[PDB]
Chain length 158, copies 4
């Protein structure tokens, strides 16, 4: 035996006033990497950018690549202020790994904050995570989790 | 200005070994309604039936708080019909919760039962509350789709 | 027969600051009631107040009188117009005895701590629980609020 | 500015109308260890045993130890030969102090209560918790197992 359940959780919260618009001006900051997996922040950012475009966010300021990235993210927030973007997405990778034990479980987790600029007010935030089955890649579990979060942001954007 | 987070949760468990083929012979039992919403189980069974077709479960027998006798009746009907796997489902939540705004809520517990031994080969619990614009059935369909999607990820 | 799992979940976030807490000046605002149970917000405030005392918060300012949102705005100014450093803002998300196959008490809450010079949220928590038939809703609520408060205490 | 939420989750499921009694004959099997933490199953078993006694379960068969799957099967067989009514079969899913932006001790467990001799599962539970940096992993584990054992007690009736 061995009991190895799989699971996924997501919590999101909307604050502020009226709707936030995906047609407004957006920035996607560098992710902070809170895992032992090198380059998880960069892969999380690439997956997130592609999902945002898919969901219809065309005007998305991004930061070319190149340490957990706290300073890069702070500096990118300042760059978004100077570019006069309305909303910045600040993301942290909480988990990104292929746990091997009795079987294989890819895990991925993220926390996302949407910050309205210039006032630096959080208008939405979300936390989600998922563990998969042995045949799933970590990248597919991460894409699912970020798809749920962005799908929720779009709905909660009202 | 209340804080009303939205959330979803899913936990699933595979207990036996070996494959579970969606091409084999399947049965979707009637659902048990554990809500104050009349016909929650009928709506759930119908949504569940449509999703299993989409996921490629082509041989799917169907037959015919409330519902506990009907489900007991239908698994024997399933065993006597020689279907290999029965899906026993319960509706844990199905309502449009009205408060500061609208939160549709739906939740379910599913068990796959291998026949004739009657061993639970997979089970899952999941639930989700969504935003005001969503209908309960759309939330329900999402929850049921995640469950069915997880079940499929078992060979 | 029917399969009705019970469950609890808690998520908690320290939004920023490497500060501390607790023997400072604290305010427990009135709760917002996002349930169909009358008095849920008052009951939730009284349970939280007791738990806060139990967890050492000796200096705690309190406020006297889908509902309750306007009162909570008013109390945040009282703490603001007083010297209050930290304000606890709570919402009751769930408070009912769900009657299906069997009894199922359910309680859930969202809490934020606001640092009250400049209204910065330094901690937020959401938690909820459903119990077994022989548990009272109030006992389930106290367990959930105790988990949130004990977490807030450890996150400092 | 990284976002590192802390969290705990528990899901339990009762299957069967019979009242299970803590004054009955019980066995605690060796845990299965689905982590990379040495001795995590042995420590899980010892915490669980002390919590069960605390919750009033005085007649508790235990196994002396030498991922543990064969040990758990053999102990289930020995419990049957001892004519115990209920065997607790546990898996350690997580037990580690994760070091990222800060420390997070993490523990998680899946428990099954098996009624013998029929080998029917009358209760099952999964729970997990990530804590704050000043917390020890064993304190997080003890909290998680106490929540599971407290739920089994309440679910069991008497």
């Amino acid at each position: 035996s061995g009991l190895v359940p799989r699971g996924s959780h997501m919590v999101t919260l909307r604050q502020g006033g009226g709707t936030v618009s995906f047609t407004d001006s957006w920035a996607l900051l560098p992710f902070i990497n809170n895992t032992e997996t090198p380059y998880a922040a960069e892969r999380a950012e690439a997956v997130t950018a592609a999902l945002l475009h898919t969901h219809g966010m065309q005007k998305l300021e991004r930061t070319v690549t190149e340490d957990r990235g706290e300073l890069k993210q702070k500096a990118a927030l300042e760059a978004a202020k100077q570019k006069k973007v309305r909303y910045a997405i600040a993301g942290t990778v909480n988990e990104w790994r292929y746990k091997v034990g009795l079987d294989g479980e890819p895990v991925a987790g993220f926390t996302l904050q949407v910050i309205e600029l210039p006032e630096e007010k959080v208008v939405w935030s979300g936390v989600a995570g998922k563990s998969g089955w042995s045949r799933d890649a970590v990248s597919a579990v991460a894409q699912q989790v970020l798809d749920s979060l962005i799908g929720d942001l779009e709905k909660a954007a009202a």
